[PDB]
Design a protein around this ligand. Structure first.
Ligand SMILES: [Mg+2]
Lengths: 70, 172, 29
RNA sequence: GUCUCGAGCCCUAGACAGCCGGGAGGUGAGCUUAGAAGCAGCUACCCUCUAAGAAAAGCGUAACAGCUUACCGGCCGAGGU
């Protein structure tokens, strides 16, 4: 239902395209709360029981694009 | 070694010399199981295959005799059935059972009828483009089925283009 | 005596406290 | 082909093989591209549910689909490699 992860990131990140080589080319950044919000939309798309695990999944499609955390 | 085969309640198996006969509601099958130092016998309710030798060659036949007998058990009860489909592209192939042999006419437009004789008490039933080969003797049934497929064999031309013939659809 | 089998037997006994052979196992202790 | 002898490893906490069932989600990863969604190329190859299940080992498609390997479970039961 709710739009994919790759898109929900490009919004609150301010950037459109990722990086040719991830974790090596830190394109964007995301606050902890910025990821907490993206974990509130994908409640159905994810299999996790707690909001904690829901984050982990989302936080797995960022460092593989250059979306550092802080 | 020694292997014991418990015969099914539906069946009764008799044996004299190197010959074993298996009778069931679906018929009877007699076979010769002859090999150096391998004794096959009917011990009341079980068939026994034993030998004092255990070399690779002996073990090979022992295992072979087992499946032969087990296959006979299955043949006299549930029976054996091979399914076949007659496929043709341009020339309508006529497959009929005449006497104790299946005849195929107009194969690839051939004027001369191709034919093969049926082995043993094997029954061949045809229902349109479907054939069913059946009987209690897997040897006889298997061959009859195979012979039918081999009957439409073509060596002269490219088989990928000339695919006409009867083929084995289901194997038991 | 693979360790993962021993560790699984423990994890099973733990959930029972609060493979079919590892279940059967975790039922006899 | 067959006979004999040795070494290592796995196995009744069920091995080897076969058969049945499962082979799931984030997500059709990002990039490149009109498109590429395991499988044209480049890079990375991360975490959830769980008894398993790759950012996919091999076919397959225009691309999907589809078919299976890995992996887990059952059936079986004795040696297997
Ligand atoms: Mg020619």
């Amino acid at each position: 239902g709710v739009p994919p992860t790759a898109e929900l990131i490009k919004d609150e990140a301010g950037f459109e395209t990722g990086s040719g080589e991830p974790q090596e080319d830190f394109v964007a950044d995301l606050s902890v709360d910025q990821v907490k919000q993206i974990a509130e939309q994908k409640h159905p798309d994810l299999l996790s029981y707690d909001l904690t695990n829901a984050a982990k999944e989302v936080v797995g499609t960022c460092t593989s694009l250059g979306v550092t955390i802080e | 070694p020694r292997v014991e085969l418990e015969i099914p309640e539906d069946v009764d198996a008799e044996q004299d010399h190197l010959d074993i006969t298996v009778e069931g509601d679906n018929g009877s099958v007699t076979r010769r199981l002859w090999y150096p130092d391998i004794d096959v016998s009917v011990d009341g309710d079980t068939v026994v295959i034993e030998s004092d030798e255990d070399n690779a060659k002996t073990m090979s036949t022992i295992g072979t005799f087992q499946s032969h007998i087990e296959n006979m058990f299955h043949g006299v009860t549930e029976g054996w059935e091979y399914g076949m489909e007659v496929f043709y592209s341009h020339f309508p192939m006529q497959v009929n059972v005449e006497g104790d042999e299946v005849v195929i006419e107009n194969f690839l437009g051939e004027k001369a009828p191709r034919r093969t004789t049926i082995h043993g008490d094997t029954d061949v039933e045809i229902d349109g483009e479907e054939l069913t080969v059946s009987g209690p003797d897997i040897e006889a049934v298997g061959q009859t089925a195979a012979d039918i497929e081999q009957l439409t064999r073509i060596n002269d031309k490219d088989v990928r283009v000339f695919q006409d013939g009867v083929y084995i659809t289901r194997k038991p | 005596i693979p360790e993962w089998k021993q560790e699984e037997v423990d994890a099973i006994v733990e959930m029972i406290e609060s493979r079919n052979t590892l279940l059967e196992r975790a039922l006899d202790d």
